[PDB]
């Protein structure tokens, strides 16, 4: 899960 | 809950959970 | 004469098979360790619980007797680290002259500890004084009970043998785990509590806690603000939801007396004639279920209340309740309850901040609550994308908040739905297809491979 | 004409004096360091932000010249680790031939990094190829950007010197601190940094979508979400301070971004036949750009528009240069929790709960701070509260604290009998207001201290 | 009546704030510690000097009482590591029964140390015998004194509590920092410390002969020196600031000291049949005592008289509490080299020559200091001299420097064009006086600093 | 074709017997090591000196030839780390096609290093660029000579083989001692200097130094105070008493030009068209005995002077002059000259501050000066009280200041006096009786035990 | 002599002994 | 050698  | 530090071993100074 | 006393001390052989928490369909490697025990009278032997912990078999050897005998573990307190053993028979106990329990020593009282060092066939002895009488912890993070410090170091093999007066009475049980020169002793009083606990209830009910988080009031303005007279009282910062307090106490309460003993600025309280003791001590001398009367200052007003005292409820348990940890596997997704041993075994990383804090900082909101984690995913075509997922807390299943792992297990079995939807802590969501998960069942545990989808306790029916 | 190219590469001498983050009326021990910079044109020197970080003085030295000169730092992007420098001489720039910036290289392309290794003050060179092109992490300041890896290791004194083509164009900026792994900041990042600054006369910073994303590699997962093909990423969370919170919702699946299809992994078409992380797209925009986003919400296709701004950090890495904010109030020293503060004392004495809030919690609103008690300066008034270090403070006299300025204001307006601080544990410290106001001078005329505030906290507060 | 004896033993809570020795306008990070103290009579508490060292506040706590009280440090001998404390309550001393001091024990005598271990705030006890009686080293403050070793290890919180006879007399003071080896400061040392302070209303300190000695164990060596018997020690060196420099000479052999025969090893009769280090005798005198010394000089017997004073240290351990001295002058920070300074930065960045001067060189005159440049605060005026840390400075404008006060004076009187500092290596830094005087405010209004001196350097200077 | 070049490279086998400095009647343990060399023409092989250091025997192996041959060490520069070898014969040299020396490379020039890695029978190659051309040190604390840095790491076994152009010329010799990825190369120019040194003098005369301690003048006020115009010059802080300078230069002199090349604020100086170089470089390109013209500013006045340049005189030597270290033993008191190797071998403590600084901070006051130390005392009835004495510098003997150990040895032999009086650094004095010391001689070295009271060089006659 | 730091390796910054 |  990545913040973009 | 949360915002406690529930074990008297990982806390210190003047905050202690009371009991046996 | 003198050597009669040493004849009451016994060497303890125990084979240990612990469960593996990381993979809890398996057990850890079987080993044998040694320790000490002694005759307390009747047909009973006293020892440390850690000596007989996870006992596959337990054997005891008399001093000056070649033959080993075979012992059974009657009852074991984990947080006070005591265990009783019975022995069979009739030969071992022949001509045995057991030890009597002394009262609690005074500082500087002479003490000798008797036990069997690791290695060798011979008994050993150390002499010193009682250096310290303090409340301490007998099991990691577990509880706080009275304890005696002595001026002499103790060999691991030497717990749980006796600690003696100069009058030959046993004043407690030696305790060593396995840079100090300070030995520890579980005192007679904690021992008595254990024995009467056992006589009354025929099982270990433990040592109660008040269920409360206290702040010392040293500062003048605090005390003035709270309307506390003279120097007395500790401020209640937090209460445990599963304890009878919190129905009784509130944040901002200053406990003042306990069973009509006054409580000071710091936690202490009258103990014996010249001495004071941490408030905790009184609490610990009670039994599970007991009521204590507590003098309180609420708002500005003196008030009396009653509180039921029960043993601490640990959301993330230290003790596992003995036996084997629960697990359930769905679509190769392996679930267990978070426990201290699991953390210990997985070490520091791969656990992670978010989860670690929850284990350190969180309290049970109700009895039976657990943190259920997904430890690993056993790779397979149904779980693709979900592999590489480690130590994640599951919150919801198909919309429903998970209370514990038996609950989760009951929800899986009642599920007729299209998908199995798991919402985790990150807000991460794993979706799986029910029918395909089932077809994969045998194939997954074969290949990995594992005897059963569950641990036995989760076959049992679920309540509420 | 080879030695011509080297002549644009300058050595950078810098003296750093940072703040003590515990008691930020003081400074830490100054140290000097060296690094590299090069001529990009106009009167401008390009280098690494960290090379000039908290600079008390900056000197630059031309190749084959003994004299140092005095450079001033013109602008610093922190998130891309880039800095512009000027020098006033007319020496220096005399007979200068600045570098041209080249385009983004392709793998196996030849590269030479030029800079000044630590010590000896003679220039150095390494040669390698471009091993990797990827979105990578920048200076733990984190904003993720495109980056180049090279087959060659780079000395710490070499960053911020240039990385060259075989055509003699600069393809990026050497970046190293302290493998056989080089890291280069590529021209497009540099370019972005320049056009940002060319407007505004100052560095605004790279924007972000403000969204927390899950790949969908699982067919079951997609069916459930009614995704047509395998494409899209799933929105787990939306930052409140982002424009996206008014537009995107948890559960949405984003599909296209300015009409580029987001893959079911995190990807996106890059150039020609290549694929790059979705983050690349967002990063190539500017603050205030509007992006059009394709989403699947419920089962239905939608189109939304989001304004893009730089991430609002609850716990900042940057500190904005110079002095950080503080209070006192009766020996209790109050500052904002920052990343730089988090390593002075490193990790301990901070504690699990704080550290995690710093790694996880997001701003609920612009300007929110996590305010901590760093320490207590022992004194009669605070007796019983000494020890007491690194504790987030929540309420003051019942009032939730927004940030340290809010806190400075509530205290100025107080007038009440006691000052009551509720901290993280529900631990509470109570002080007598008069006694505190009377002990002020004694405490900081003792301990001893320039003033009872950082200068900014004097300004009138907001809302 | 046992619990009666314990009731005199108190727990000590102390908050230490020391100076930063590099930039001594600042302080290091305060920390709190605990220790022990006991009642010796009058209104006085006895404890370890280090327990109260650089105290911002001191609290004491009676056994079986929850309340802390406020103690003030009355007097501190540093070289014997002893301290007296007072408390104003009339609580506290209410119902007090102070300890009686017993005589010096004999080996195998039973001993119990009583104190408060770190944490738990309950009293503790250990029992052992007296294992050793010897002249030992004190707090690296060094003055060598009589000391007791015990069969028992002692917790750090236990020093400065009492060590007891079986008759219940105090035989000394527990001393521990941080084996199964205890160290006790014996009553005779305590006694010395009290009578010293009882005069003068203050601590003068143990004296020394001021002489550097070689044993003669070699018969050849003795024949050569024409020593009658095997006895005597040989004088290699004499401290200039000692009274002995006017009386004793290199080459002398000292034979008797106040009519006690010094052995050819370093010894001396102790009590009854025991033998103790010569140092014991000197130590049992008081500053200003005159001692009569037997010597063999050339081949001839002589008798001389020497006044005895506390050792004059070129590089001090003590620092005399509170703020150490400093200058600045154009960013160059000047302080005296001290032992406490030598460990902040510990050993490195000091360098071989300095460290050795600190371990060897002796004062040529009272008040001599080794003055160092700790660091340089970068600025236009000092360009080229930054870096430049921990360097002893010798001359200022041609003038040999006596100490930092001398240096403060020469600078105040300067009026010349350049300020010229010659350092240890013959490295020389030259500054323009005007430019320096003009950069002052900017430098300390930047860096940034309370003032350009430590307060003492303002007072008029001497000669 | 290409492989013809690699055929000029040779593998070097060398057996090493070093002396023990701690006990210098003894030698260290004999071992064998490997390295690289190459044919430079004539009958000569080039290598690193450290490859053949303390050579018991030296053997070389051609590439693709099973037989080992046997080589002699013609001459060895220690501070430039170069050695020449000759080989016998007539078979080895058959069909050999030696390497020619290239000129000095430019930054980014392609380089390949050729040599024989430790282990295996096969030759290896690494390619990179010239990363750096700088002045560095070739031997610990010894000297500073030009050097080439390359972009590729080098295997210890690979020095002292050749470093090549892309034109096949050798541009220097590889150097590796035995976290970088940076290889070092002794350049052709330092090599030329060595070869012509050898042709001219038929022995190694080394690389001269100016004998001076310099300070950079960056600061404006310094330069103004010293009356130095523009930006030029370095300030003379100290001069070596054994160097022709100090008869010529004084503290406070600002050297301005050297052989009519101007010297800047920092140490640098015109080198090649776009480049500058540390002043040291010019100094190093001279030969022992050469005169340099030096432009100076003294007071405020420009002045020209001439200076003879000789190799540095090291009070505490790094190199020992090869062979075995001197020693003399009196009454069991063992004396040797202080040297770096001795320090290295005794490590850090037991050396001590006072002595260590002397070794770091001190210069020779005259040619032939040494620091003589008493390393250990071999216990015996004459030396009682003097045992336990370690690493002490001796200053005087019977009143006379000791110049070096040959001097001390000459004084012992000329001594007819009653006592042997040794004054040490502490002002400590050891007195011994002459006649008894002699009687003990045989007994002491028997018992300890040691072949000889001396090392051979101290039997020789003493001069002045 | 003394007060030097004779090796250019144990000194640093702007103090260097000149030569080979 | 001791200082006294």
* CA–CA distance, F258 with F264 (Å, rounded to integer): 11
Angstroms from E180 CA to nearest CA on chain C: 7
Q: Which of D255, D253, D262 is nearest to D297 (CA)?
A: D253
Q: Where are the beta strands (DSSP E) in F299-454?
A: 301-308, 328-330, 333-337, 372-377, 392-397, 400-401, 419-424, 429-433
Say which of C107, C181, C268 has its CB closest to residue E66: C268
Tell whether C438 is within 8 A of chain B (Cβ): no
Q: Where are the beta strands (DSSP E) in F137-265?
A: 145-150, 162-164, 170-175, 183-187, 209-216, 234-239, 254-258, 261-262
What domains appear along chain D, each with residue ranges and CATH number? Answer: 1-311 (no CATH), 312-463 (3.20.190.20)
Tell whether E425 is within 8 A of chain G (Cβ): yes
- Chain mean position to CA E149: 21
- C-alpha separations of F112 from C376, F162, F164, G1 in Å: 50, 8, 5, 46
Active site residue F81: yes
* CA–CA distance, E227 with E298 (Å, rounded to integer): 10
Size of interface D-F (CB pairs under 8 A): 57
Q: Which of C377, C242, C217 is nearest to C310 (CA)?
A: C242
- Secondary structure class of D257 (helix, strand, coil): strand
Q: Give the up-direction half-sphere exposure of residue D133: CA atoms within 13 A in the CB hemisphere.
A: 19
Chains G and F make contact, 3+ CB pairs within 8 Å: yes
* CA–CA distance, E82 with E319 (Å, rounded to integer): 16
Judge contact between E266 and E233, C-beta under 8 A.
Answer: yes
* CA–CA distance, D151 with D146 (Å, rounded to integer): 17
Judge contact between E34 and D387, C-beta under 8 A.
Answer: no
Q: State the Cα angle at E9 between E5 and E14, rounded to 5°.
A: 180
Query: What is the number of other CB atoms lying within 10 angstroms of the CB of residue C8?
Result: 24
Contact flag B20-C143 (C-beta cutoff 8 Å): yes
* CA–CA distance, G20 with G4 (Å, rounded to integer): 18
Q: Where are the beta strands (DSSP E) in E23-143?
A: 31-41, 44-47, 55-61, 69-77, 82-87, 110-115, 124-137
Torsion angle (degrees, nearest 10) of CA E328, E332, E334, E340: 110
Q: State the Cα angle at E255 between E253 and E261, rounded to 5°.
A: 160
Say which of B4, B10, B19 has its CB closest to residue C209: B19
* CA–CA distance, E209 with E235 (Å, rounded to integer): 11
Angstroms from A1 CA to nearest CA on chain D: 5
- Secondary structure class of C256 (helix, strand, coil): strand
Judge contact between E175 and E156, C-beta under 8 A.
Answer: no
Which residue in chain E is spatially nearest to F427 when comparing CA positions? E236
Q: Which resolution in angstroms does this entry have?
A: 2.8
Chains A and D make contact, 3+ CB pairs within 8 Å: yes
Contact flag H3-E214 (C-beta cutoff 8 Å): no
Phi-psi map region of D346: left, alpha, beta (phi>0 left; psi -120 to 50 alpha): left
| C-alpha gyration radius of chain A | 4
Phi/psi of residue E290, nearest 5 degrees: -105, 130
DSSP code for D324: P
Tell whether C216 is within 8 A of chain B (Cβ): yes
Please, what is the angle between helix C353-361 and helix D352-359, to 10°? Answer: 140
DSSP code for D105: -
- Chain mean position to CA E4: 35
Q: Is F382 exposed, middle or buried (0-12, 13-18, 19+ CB in 10 A)?
A: buried
Which residue in chain E is spatially nearest to C232 when comparing CA positions? E66
Identify how many contiguous H helices and E strands chain D contains and give both numbers.
9, 26
Under 8 Å CB-to-CB from C390, ≥6 apart: which residues?
C350, C374, C375, C376
- Chain mean position to CA E110: 31
Q: Is F64 exposed, middle or buried (0-12, 13-18, 19+ CB in 10 A)?
A: exposed
Chains D and F make contact, 3+ CB pairs within 8 Å: yes
Q: Give the up-direction half-sphere exposure of residue E263: CA atoms within 13 A in the CB hemisphere.
A: 14
Torsion angle (degrees, nearest 10) of CA D139, D143, D146, D151: 20
Active site residue F159: yes
Suggest the residue from C137, C210, C234, C360 to mutate for an interface test with chain B (most B CBs closer than 10 A).
Answer: C360
* CA–CA distance, E136 with E156 (Å, rounded to integer): 19
Contact flag F385-E216 (C-beta cutoff 8 Å): yes
Contact flag D279-A1 (C-beta cutoff 8 Å): no
Q: Give the up-direction half-sphere exposure of residue D394: CA atoms within 13 A in the CB hemisphere.
A: 10
Active site residue D301: no
Q: Which of E106, E159, E103 is nearest to E130 (CA)?
A: E106
Range C226-229 contact pairs with CB under 8 angstroms and sequence separation of 24 or more? C226/C252, C226/C254, C226/C297, C227/C297, C227/C299, C227/C300, C228/C254, C228/C256, C228/C297
Which residues in chain B are closer than 8 Å to D425, comparing Cβ atoms? 3-5, 11, 15
| C-alpha gyration radius of chain H | 4
Which residue in chain B is spatially nearest to C239 when comparing CA positions? B17
* CA–CA distance, F156 with F164 (Å, rounded to integer): 18
* CA–CA distance, C124 with C11 (Å, rounded to integer): 11
* CA–CA distance, C59 with C70 (Å, rounded to integer): 4
Neighbors of chain G by Cβ distance (3+ pairs < 8 Å): E, F
Q: Which of C318, C385, F299 is nearest to D220 (CA)?
A: C385
* CA–CA distance, D317 with C323 (Å, rounded to integer): 48
Under 8 Å CB-to-CB from D451, ≥6 apart: which residues?
D25, D444
Q: Give the up-direction half-sphere exposure of residue F432: CA atoms within 13 A in the CB hemisphere.
A: 29
Contact flag D425-B13 (C-beta cutoff 8 Å): no
List the beta bridge partners of residue C313.
none
- Chain mean position to CA F456: 23
- C-alpha separations of C132 from C106, E34, E116, F371 in Å: 9, 17, 10, 60
Mark which residues 84-143 of E lie under 8 Å from C by CB: 112, 117, 120-127
Query: What is the number of other CB atoms lying within 10 angstroms of the CB of residue F179?
Result: 5
* CA–CA distance, E281 with E135 (Å, rounded to integer): 11
Contact flag E426-G13 (C-beta cutoff 8 Å): no
Q: State the Cα angle at D231 between D230 and D234, rounded to 5°.
A: 115
Judge contact between C47 and C85, C-beta under 8 A.
Answer: yes
Q: Where are the beta strands (DSSP E) in E175-323?
A: 182-186, 211-215, 233-238, 253-257, 260-261, 267-269, 275-277, 290-297, 300-307
Phi/psi of residue F41, nearest 5 degrees: 110, 175
Phi-psi map region of F181: left, alpha, beta (phi>0 left; psi -120 to 50 alpha): left
Enumerate residues preceding breaks in chain G (C to N > 2.5 Å): none
Say which of E220, E352, E383 has its CB closest to residue F360: E352
Tell whether E313 is within 8 A of chain F (Cβ): no
DSSP code for C243: S
List the beta bridge partners of residue C59.
C13, C70
Q: Which of F319, F307, F206, F194 is nearest to F258 (CA)?
A: F307
Q: State the Cα angle at E333 between E332 and E336, rounded to 5°.
A: 135
* CA–CA distance, E44 with E31 (Å, rounded to integer): 25
Number of residues assigned to chain C: 464
Q: Which of C241, D97, D227, G1 is nearest to E424 (CA)?
A: G1
* CA–CA distance, C105 with C275 (Å, rounded to integer): 13
Q: Which of E213, E210, E220, E311 is nearest to E268 (CA)?
A: E213
Judge contact between E237 and E364, C-beta under 8 A.
Answer: no
Under 8 Å CB-to-CB from D208, ≥6 apart: which residues?
A3, A4, D143, D242, D282, D308, D309, D310, D311
DSSP code for E452: S
Q: Give the up-direction half-sphere exposure of residue C64: CA atoms within 13 A in the CB hemisphere.
A: 7
Q: Which of D159, D338, D374, D454 is catalytic?
A: D159
Q: Which of F16, F36, F50, F455 is catalytic?
A: F50
Q: Is F35 exposed, middle or buried (0-12, 13-18, 19+ CB in 10 A)?
A: buried
DSSP code for D208: B
Torsion angle (degrees, nearest 10) of CA F245, F251, F252, F254: 30
- Secondary structure class of D79 (helix, strand, coil): coil
Phi/psi of residue C122, nearest 5 degrees: -110, 150
Torsion angle (degrees, nearest 10) of CA F372, F378, F384, F387: 60
């Amino acid at each position: 899960x990545x913040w973009x | 809950x949360x915002x406690x530090x529930x074990x008297x071993x990982x806390x210190x100074x003047x905050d202690x959970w009371x009991x046996x | 004469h003198d050597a009669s006393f040493l004849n009451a001390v016994v060497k303890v052989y125990c084979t240990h098979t612990a469960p593996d928490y990381s993979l809890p369909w398996q057990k850890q490697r079987q080993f044998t360790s040694t320790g000490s025990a002694f005759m307390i009278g009747d047909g009973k032997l006293l020892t440390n619980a850690h000596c007989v912990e996870h006992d596959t078999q337990v054997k005891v050897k008399r001093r000056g007797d070649d033959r080993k005998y075979v012992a059974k573990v009657l009852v074991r307190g984990v947080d006070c680290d005591i265990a009783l053993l019975s022995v069979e028979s009739e030969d071992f106990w022949k001509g045995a002259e057991p030890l009597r329990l002394g009262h609690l020593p005074r500082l500087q009282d002479s003490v000798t500890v008797v036990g069997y060092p690791l290695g060798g066939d011979t008994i050993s002895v150390t002499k010193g004084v009682v250096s310290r009488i303090e409340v301490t912890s007998y099991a990691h993070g577990s509880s706080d009970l009275l304890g005696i410090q002595i001026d002499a170091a103790i060999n691991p093999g030497n717990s749980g043998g006796p600690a003696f007066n100069d009058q030959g009475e046993c004043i407690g049980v030696a305790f060593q785990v396995y840079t100090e020169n300070i030995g520890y002793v579980i005192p007679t009083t904690v021992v008595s509590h254990f024995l009467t606990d056992y006589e009354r209830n025929g099982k270990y009910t433990g040592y109660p806690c008040l269920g409360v988080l206290l702040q010392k009031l040293e500062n003048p303005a605090l005390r003035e603000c709270l309307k506390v007279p003279t120097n007395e009282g500790v401020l209640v910062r937090r209460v445990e939801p599963t304890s009878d307090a919190s129905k009784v106490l509130k944040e901002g309460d200053v406990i003042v007396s306990f069973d009509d003993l006054h409580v000071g600025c710091e936690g202490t309280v009258p103990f014996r004639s010249s001495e004071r003791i941490a408030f905790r001590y009184l609490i610990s001398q009670k039994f599970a279920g007991d009521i204590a009367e507590i003098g309180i200052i609420r708002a500005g007003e003196h008030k009396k209340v009653q509180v039921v005292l029960r043993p601490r409820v640990h959301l993330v348990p230290y003790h596992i309740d003995g036996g084997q940890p629960s697990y359930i596997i769905v679509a190769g997704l392996v679930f267990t309850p978070l426990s201290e041993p699991l953390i210990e075994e997985e070490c520091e990383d791969t656990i992670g901040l978010k989860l670690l804090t929850k284990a350190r900082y969180s309290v049970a909101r109700f009895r039976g609550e657990q943190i259920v984690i997904l430890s690993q995913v056993l790779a397979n075509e149904v779980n693709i994308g979900y592999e590489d997922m480690n130590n994640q807390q599951v919150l919801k299943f198909n919309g429903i908040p998970i209370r514990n792992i038996h609950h989760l297990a009951h929800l899986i079995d009642m599920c007729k739905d299209k998908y199995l939807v798991f919402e985790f802590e990150d807000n991460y969501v794993a979706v799986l297809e029910r029918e395909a998960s089932n077809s994969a069942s045998l194939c997954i545990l074969k290949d990995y491979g594992i005897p059963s989808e569950r641990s036995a306790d989760l076959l049992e029916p679920y309540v509420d």
